Design an enzyme around this catalytic site. Structure first.
Site, short mmCIF file in Angstrom:
data_model
loop_
_atom_site.label_atom_id
_atom_site.label_comp_id
_atom_site.label_asym_id
_atom_site.label_seq_id
_atom_site.Cartn_x
_atom_site.Cartn_y
_atom_site.Cartn_z
N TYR A 1 0.83 -1.20 0.00
CA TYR A 1 0.00 0.00 0.00
C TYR A 1 0.87 1.25 0.00
CZ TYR A 1 -2.24 3.94 2.44
OH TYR A 1 -2.66 5.19 2.83
N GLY B 1 -9.16 3.26 -2.87
CA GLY B 1 -10.50 2.80 -2.55
C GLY B 1 -10.68 1.31 -2.76
#
Lengths: 509, 509, 509, 509
Positions: free
Chosen positions: A53, A60
Site C-alpha cells: 500500500y 478505494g
C-alpha cells in the site's frame, strides 16, 4: 553560496541563509547509497509481484489491488494533478526555495523510495533559481501539505508554472531554464512528493526568523529608549537574573549589558540616573524579553528538528526490506511551535509600544511632549504613537491558537489534523505589526537622544542611531510623518540592527 | 447614475453602489443652508474674538489660548502632515471612494463649520475618479480615523499622492486632473477633515457587502447540495419556522423554498425524499443561515446609521451659536458591528464546509466517493475538500473580537479606543476564506448533480449550474484542480449568484 | 406572584422575574384546546397504525419501523435515562426554574403532542419550588439541550434528584412534595421533553439580565466618577448624540443627563467645567456604553423570541394532521446572541477599569494619589486598582466566541451544532469580572467625592453614595481592603443601583 | 512526609507531592547563614541611618524619604492591609499550601532581608495544616502576586482568617493552632512577603500536574481504544518516530509500545491487524500526543526554575552589602508557560474526542452503533459522545492566551504586566473538560472491549479495565448514564491510571 548537503544535518543558521538568499547546492556523495537502496527495495517489492500500500496499490476499491505498471505510472500524475487544489496568493520565491530544499533534505535521507533523478530535478530548479508557483492556502498539515507540495511537484511533470527572474514561465519554459525536461513518476513517487510537513515547517521557520530579527532589534531599541529617558542600568545587574534562574532572562540581561555598557556619556550626564524608579517597560525588559527568548528557543528546537525530519509516507526501510505507514505527515508539533512564536512576537511588540508610550509622556520621559519642540503648534510623534498602538493591539487577536482546531476530512479517515500552515502564516503579519512598533520606537528614541544635545550613548547604540539617521532626519517642525516610519521599517526588515546583538544568543544566529 | 446627495440620507443600497462602482455626485440644493450657516458661525466666533477649542485654539498650553490666525492657517497644515502617520498597503480605489463620499456626506450636514469649497474639492476628486493614497493601518478609531483621513487630506493640500486610471500621480497633477489647485485650510478645517469614523465605517461596510454576497451564494449553493444528495425539502416548511418565531430563519427558509420549489425533476427521481433524516448541515440550514442573516442585519443597521453620522469634533451648532466637544470619533459601535459580522461570515463558511464534507461521504451523499467515477485511480474532489477545511478553520481564530481591546494613547488623554479599523478589515480575509469554501461547494454540487445523468434541478438552481459550467467543465478523470477553484471563486466574487435570491432580503439588496 | 401563562407571550420583564424569584403559575384556560388537540393527533396516528418517525418509530434499524406499543412506553424511559449524561456542577435553583418554565412555555403552545398532565407535572414542581438536579455541561445546543433536559425530566419519572429548601431529595420524596407521583411517558413525550433550546436560552437570558444590571450600575458609577474628578457634562449634550444618530448612544446619554442633571454643588465648585478636555473614558461614555446597549438589545430581541419558541422536534400540526421533522433544536441564534452579549459585558468593564485608572492618577483626577490622604505612608486604593485591571483583562479571552465552533456527533448525522450553552454560561463569569470592576469604581468615586469635603453631587447620585456608605465607610487610613470590595459587589449583585436608571431603557426593565 | 528543605532545590516531584498532600517541613541547617546575613544587612542600613528604597523610605513624597522606625513598623502593617484587595472564591487548601511552601522556599534563600521568625511562622502554619484564606482573583503577576500574598500574610499579623480541618477560624485561633501568636513586621518585610510570583507559579504548576495526569490517562485510554476497534500497533513502530526525530513523539510511541506490547489476545483474535488503515485519531497518537508532551515539558522547565526563584524586590545582596530593585516580580515566563500548557490540555482532549467519535461509528469501530446491542430501542453511548464534544469544544476558546494582554496600573509606573494568574487558573477548568472527555473514552473502550467476549488486552491495559470495572459495570440496557461518567471522572482525578505509565517520561513523575 554552495551548500554540500548531508541530508538531515541542516542547521538553523543554514536554514536562515537558505531563506534569506539563493543557494547553489549539491547532494553529498555519501547520500547516494541509501537513496538508491530505497528505490531498489521498492523495485524488488514490485518485481516480486508483492503488494505494498502506498507503493503499487490503487485507491478505494483498489487499495488492496496491485496496479498495472502503465496505470501505476498514470496514477502518479493523477495524484499530483488532483492534489494541486490550493488557493490564494502565490508564495514568494524565498519561501518556495525553502520548501524545495526541505523536501530535498527529507527525500535524500533514503527512506522514501524515490529515484535520485527526481531529487536531482528539484536540486536543479533551486540552483537555477526557478521557483514553482505555490498558492498560500489549502493545507491542514496532516498526511502532509499535499496541496502546496503538489503545486510544487507540477512543474516537475511539465505542468503548472514557475517564476524565473520575477516572471512567470510555463513549466516547459521553466524546466528548460533548469536544463530539464518533464519527468514521468514511478511507484510511490507521487506520495513521496506530496506527503510531508515541509510547507508547514517552512511557514513556521520564516515566523521564527522574523521573531529572532525582532528580538535583536528590540534589545537595541530598548537600550536606546532607556538612554533617551535617562533610564537606569541597575535592572540589568547580573545578580538579579542569577537569583531568578531563568535562562532566557539571564541571557537577555547579558545582551542589554553588552549593548549598553556600564555607563555612557549621556547616562553620566545627570547627577541622578536611577534616583527615581524606572517603569516596567524599561525595568522589566529582561524578564519580558527573557520570556520571549525562551519561547522562541522552544519553538526553534522543534522546528530545527522538523526541518531534518523524514516526513513522507509510507516509509521504506530497505535495511529491513520493510515498507511502513505512519503518521509523520501530521504537523501538530509544528502547529504548536507556531502558536508559541505568536506569544513571543506579540509580547515583543507590546513592550515596545509601552516604551513608546513612556517616551510620549512628559511626566515620564524627561522629554518635551510628543518628542518635539514648539509643542503648542506641532503634534510631533503623537499619531505615530497611535499607529504603534493600532499595530500592537492587532497582535492580541492574531495570537489566538490555530493548533487547537481541527476538522475531519475524507469520510473521517483524516479525522484529526494540525492546522500548522495557518499557525505559521499568521506569524508573518504579526511580525509586520511588531516591526512597525519597533520602527516607531527606534524613531522616538533617536529623536529623544538628539534632544540631549551632543551627548552620545554606547558604541553599539551609537551605531544603531547612525543606521537610522542615514535615512531619516531629526524631526524639527511637523512634516509628513509616514515616510519616516516606512524607512525605519525597511531598515529593520533588512536586519540593520541584527549585527549588534551578541552572537550565539538566538537559535539561528 | 448621478447621485444628488441630500446629506444624511444615503441608503445601504446607495452605499453598495458607491463601493461597487465609480460615482458622479452633486450636493442637493437643500444642503447649502446648513453648510453656510455652519461656516458663518465659525466666522462669527473668530470675528467676535471669542475663544473656542477646536476652532481657534492652539495645542497643549495653547489649548486655552486663542491663536494668531496667520499661525492658525499653518496649524491646519501641520496637523495634516504630522497626522499622516499611517502604514501598510495602499487601500484600493473603491474603498478610497467610499471613504471620501462618507466624509463628504458628514461634512455636508452642516455641523463641522468647514467651507463649502473644501467639500467641493472632495466632490471633484470623486467625480474625476482621482483617489488619494491611503495606507491600510494606523487608526484605532477614537478621536477618529486620524491617519487614513490625513493621508486622504494631504492631496487637497498638494501633498501625498493620488491614483488615476490605475497610476500614481503627484498630488498637483492629480488635483489638476480634477480641475483643482492646492487648497489652504482655514479654522477648524484640519480637525473637520481628520476626525470621524469614515475609514472604520468604510472598512466594516465592505465587510457587510461581502457577508451579504456570501449569504446569497450560500442559499443557492446549499440548494444545489440538497438536490445533489437527494435531500428533503421538508426542513424548509414555513410552519417549522413560524413556530420558532425567528425572523432571520423565517426569511431564510422562504428563500430556500423560492429557489428549490416544491420539487424538481431530480427530486422526483427517487421514491423516498424524506424517509430518512438529512444531516444538520442540510436540515438546519434555515436555523443556522437565519442566525447569520440576523447578525448581519443587526450590523447593517448600525453601519447604515454610522454612514450618515456627523462624526467629527468639535461640533458646531449654528442654531444655538454653540461649539461643543464630544466623542463621536469613538468608533465603538462600528467595531462591535464588524465583530458581529465575523460570526456570520465564519458560520456561513462552516456550514458550507460541512455540506462539502457530506458530499464526499458515500454513506451520506448517495454519490461516488469524492464525486468522481473511476475511483480506483482517481482522487476527484478529495483534496479540494481539505482546502475547504483549511479555509473554514482559519475563520475560527480570525473571529476573535477586536472590539474588546484598547490601549491608552497620547499620555492617556485618549485612554480608551475602539479598534474598529482592525475589526472591519479582518472581515475581508474571512470573506475570502468563506468565498473559497462556497466555490468548492458550488463545484461539488454541480459535479454531483451531473452524475444524476440528465436530471434537472429547479429553474433558479439550473441557472446557477449554468453560470458555473460556462467556466468550468464536469470533472471526468483527475486533472489540475486549482484552476477550477480559481474560476468558481471569481464567479462568486463577481456576484454571479446574487441575483437568484428573492428581493428585499438583504439589508443593502 | 401568580402568573397565568398565555403560552408564547412571555415578556423579557416576566422572564427576569421568573429568573429572579420563585413563581406561582397556571396555564390560561385558553391554552387547553391546542395542547389537547396536539395529543389527539398523535393518538390518531397511533390508532390508525400510521408510521411517524419521532412518534411511533424506533431507532436506527427501527427509525422507519413502527414499534410495539409496550416498547413505545419503554422507549420513552430509556431515552430519558440514556440521555441524562451531563456533567459538572449543579445549576442553581433559579436557573432550573427558568428552564422549567421555558419548557412549560414551549410545550403549552400545542405543537409537541404531549399530554397536558405532563405539563401540569412540571407546573406543579415549579409552584412547589422543587428543582430537579441539572448539571452544567454536556449540551452542544443541537437537536436540543438533550442532556440537561433529560436530567430535569428524570424527576418526572421518579428518577434522579431534586432540591427543595436547599436540600437534595429523592425524586419520589421530591414528587410527593409537589403532590405528584412518578409519571409514565407516552409516544413522542420523551422527545418533546428532551428536544428544544430551553437550557441554551436560559443560560443566555441570565447573561442578559446580568449585562443589563451591569449597564445600569455603570451609568451611576460613570456619573460618580465624572463628579469625583470634576469632569464635564458637555459630553452628554443631546445634540451631539442626535447628530450621530445611534439609538443606543442617544438613549445612554439621556440616562447620564437624567442622573447627573445640568450641574451640581460639586460641579459648580470649580471655575472651569469644559476648559480642559475630559479623557475618553469620561467623554466617550455615551459612545461606548451606547454601543454596549445596542448589543444587549440586539441579543435581547433574539432571546425574548427564543423564549417563546416552539423548539422541540418533530412538530405536530393537529390542524393539518401533519407531523414534521425540522431543525428548531439548533440553537445557533442563541449562541450568537451570547457571543454578542460578551462584547457588551467586556466593554462595560473595560471602560469602568479605565475610569478607575483615571481616578488614581494625580495628574488627571485632581485628587490625592490613590484616593487617600497621607500618601507617604498609605497605599489607599493602589492594589484595588490592580484587582480591577486583572478582572477586566480576563474578559478579553473570555470574549472569544463559541458560536464559531462545532464538532460532528452521531456519525456525522448531527454534523453541525451551535455550542450555545458554552456561549451563554461564560457570560456569568464575565459578569462577575465586570461586577468586581464596577464595585471598585463605585468605591473609588465615593471616596474621591468624600474628599471634596461636604460637596454634594446630584440627587440620584447622592442616593448612589448613600447606598454604599450604608455598608462601607470612608477610607481614612489603610485598612483590610477586601471586605469593602465584597460588600460593594454584593450590593451591585442585589441591584442596589438599578433603580436609579430611567425606566424603559433596558430590554427587560 | 518530612521534607528537609534546602532552599532553591525543590524538584518537580517534590512540588507534586506538596500539591497532592500535607507536608511536614523543616529548613536545612544550611539556610540560616544567608537568611541571617540578609536581615543583618537590612538592620545595619537602618542603624547607619542610610536611605534605602524598599527598606526605610516611605511612599510618594517619601519615595526619597527615610521613615521614623515606629512608623516603619506601621508602614508594614498598612502595606499588608491595603494590599489584601483580592476577590473571588477561596483557593483550596492544597493550593494555599503550595503557595506558602513556595514563599518559604524563596525567602529562605536569603536575599529578602526578612527575619527567620517570619519564615518559621509560615513553616509552622504549613506543618499545622492551617491554611490562610486566599481569594482566587486580583493579581496581574507583575511587582508580584501582591493581593493573594497579602491575604496570606494577614494571618501572620493576627488578621484575616484561616481554614483548619475544613473550617474557618479567626487569625488568632488559627495562629494558636500552629503554636503562634500574632507577629509584628520589620522593615522591608511587608514587601518581602507581598512581592514575588509564588501565586502565579502555584496556579500554573497545578495546571502542569493536571496536564501530566491527563497525558498519562490518555496513553492508557488511547491504548484501550486501539484494542477495542481492532487497531494496528504498526503506528508505534520505533523506526517511524526515529526518522522524524521529535523526542516528545519518540518518548510517546515508546510508552504506547510499553502499554500495548507487540500484540495481545484480543489483537491476535483477528487475521489482519494492520491490513486496513487506521484513522489519524489512532494512527497519529504518537505525533499529536508527542507534541503535547513537548509542550508540557517546555512549560515544566520554566515553572520548575520559577518555583525555586528568588522573586521579591528589592533584593538584598549582603555579600556586597547592596540592595537592588529589579523586575523579578514580573511573571511573564509563567504566563507563557501557562498559555503553552493550554495547547497541550486542549489537544489531548481533542484527540480523545475523535477516538470516542470513531468508537461510535459502526463503519469505523467494527462494533455495534453507540456501543450497545439491541440498537433499535437503546441509545447507549450516543449522548455521552455529545457530552464529550461539548467539553472538547469549550477548550478552544479557553485556549486564547492571557499572556498577550496587559493594562498599565498604578499611575503608569506598572505599565506592563504578565496576567500570569489568569493564564494559569484557566488551566484547571480546561483540565476538567479534558478529564471528562477521557472518562468517556475510558467507558467506551472498556464497553467495546467487553463486546469482544472473553478476550483480554495487554497486562497493563487489563489493569486499566479492572480499575474502571471496579466502579462501573458493562453497559447492557439503557440506564441512567451520568453517574457512570462521574465515577470515571473521579477515578481519573484520583490518578487511577497514572501508575501504568513508564517512569521518567513526565517532568514531575
Amino acid at each position: 553560496t554552495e551548500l554540500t548537503l548531508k541530508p538531515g544535518t541542516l542547521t538553523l543558521a543554514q536554514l536562515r541563509a537558505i531563506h534569506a538568499a539563493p543557494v547553489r547546492l549539491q547532494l553529498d556523495a555519501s547520500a547516494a547509497p541509501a537513496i538508491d537502496a530505497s528505490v531498489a527495495c521498492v523495485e524488488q517489492i514490485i518485481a516480486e509481484d508483492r503488494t505494498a500500500y502506498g507503493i503499487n496499490t490503487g485507491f478505494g476499491l483498489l487499495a488492496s489491488t496491485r496496479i498495472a505498471s502503465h496505470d501505476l505510472e498514470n496514477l502518479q500524475r493523477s495524484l499530483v494533478l488532483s492534489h494541486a487544489a490550493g488557493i490564494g496568493a502565490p508564495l514568494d520565491d524565498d519561501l518556495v526555495r525553502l520548501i524545495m530544499v526541505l523536501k530535498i533534505n527529507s527525500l535524500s535521507r533514503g527512506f522514501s523510495g524515490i529515484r535520485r533523478k527526481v531529487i536531482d530535478a528539484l536540486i536543479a530548479l533551486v540552483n537555477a533559481e526557478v521557483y514553482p508557483h505555490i498558492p498560500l492556502k489549502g493545507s491542514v498539515g496532516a498526511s502532509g501539505d499535499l496541496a502546496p507540495l503538489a503545486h510544487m511537484s507540477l512543474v516537475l511533470l511539465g505542468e503548472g508554472k514557475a517564476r524565473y527572474k520575477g516572471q512567470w514561465l510555463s513549466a516547459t519554459e521553466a524546466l528548460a531554464v533548469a536544463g530539464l525536461e518533464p519527468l514521468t513518476l514511478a511507484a510511490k513517487e507521487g506520495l513521496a512528493l506530496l506527503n510531508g510537513t515541509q510547507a508547514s515547517t517552512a511557514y513556521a521557520l520564516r515566523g521564527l526568523f522574523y521573531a529572532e530579527d525582532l528580538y535583536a532589534a528590540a534589545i537595541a531599541c530598548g537600550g536606546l529608549s532607556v538612554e533617551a529617558v535617562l533610564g537606569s542600568r541597575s535592572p540589568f545587574d547580573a545578580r538579579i537574573h542569577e537569583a531568578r534562574g531563568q535562562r532566557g532572562q539571564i541571557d537577555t540581561a547579558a545582551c542589554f549589558r553588552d549593548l549598553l555598557g556600564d555607563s555612557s556619556e549621556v547616562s553620566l550626564s545627570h547627577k541622578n540616573a536611577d534616583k527615581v524608579q524606572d517603569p516596567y517597560s524599561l525595568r522589566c525588559q529582561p524578564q519580558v524579553m527573557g520570556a520571549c527568548l525562551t519561547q522562541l528557543r522552544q519553538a526553534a528546537e522543534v522546528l530545527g528538528i522538523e526541518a531534518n525530519a523524514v516526513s513522507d509516507n509510507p516509509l521504506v526501510f530497505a535495511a529491513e526490506g520493510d515498507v511502513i505507514s505512519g503518521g509523520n505527515g501530521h504537523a501538530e508539533p509544528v502547529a504548536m511551535a507556531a502558536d508559541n512564536l505568536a506569544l513571543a512576537i506579540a509580547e515583543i511588540g507590546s513592550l515596545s509600544e509601552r516604551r513608546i508610550s513612556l517616551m510620549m509622556d512628559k511626566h515620564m520621559s524627561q522629554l518635551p511632549p510628543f518628542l518635539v519642540e514648539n509643542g503648542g503648534v506641532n503634534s510631533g510623534f503623537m499619531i505615530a504613537q497611535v499607529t504603534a498602538a493600532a499595530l500592537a493591539s492587532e497582535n492580541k487577536a492574531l495570537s489566538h491558537p490555530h493548533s487547537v482546531d481541527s476538522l475531519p476530512t475524507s469520510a473521517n479517515q483524516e479525522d484529526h489534523v494540525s492546522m500548522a500552515p495557518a499557525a505559521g502564516k499568521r506569524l508573518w503579519e504579526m511580525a509586520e505589526n511588531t516591526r512597525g512598533v519597533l520602527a516607531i520606537e527606534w524613531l522616538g528614541a533617536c529623536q529623544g537622544l538628539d534632544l540631549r544635545k551632543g551627548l552620545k550613548t554606547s558604541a553599539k547604540l551609537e551605531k544603531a542611531r547612525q543606521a537610522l539617521r542615514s535615512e531619516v532626519a531629526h524631526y524639527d517642525r511637523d512634516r509628513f510623518f509616514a515616510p519616516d516610519i516606512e524607512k525605519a521599517v525597511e531598515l529593520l526588515a533588512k536586519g540593520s540592527l541584527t549585527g549588534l546583538l551578541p552572537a550565539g544568543v538566538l537559535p539561528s544566529l
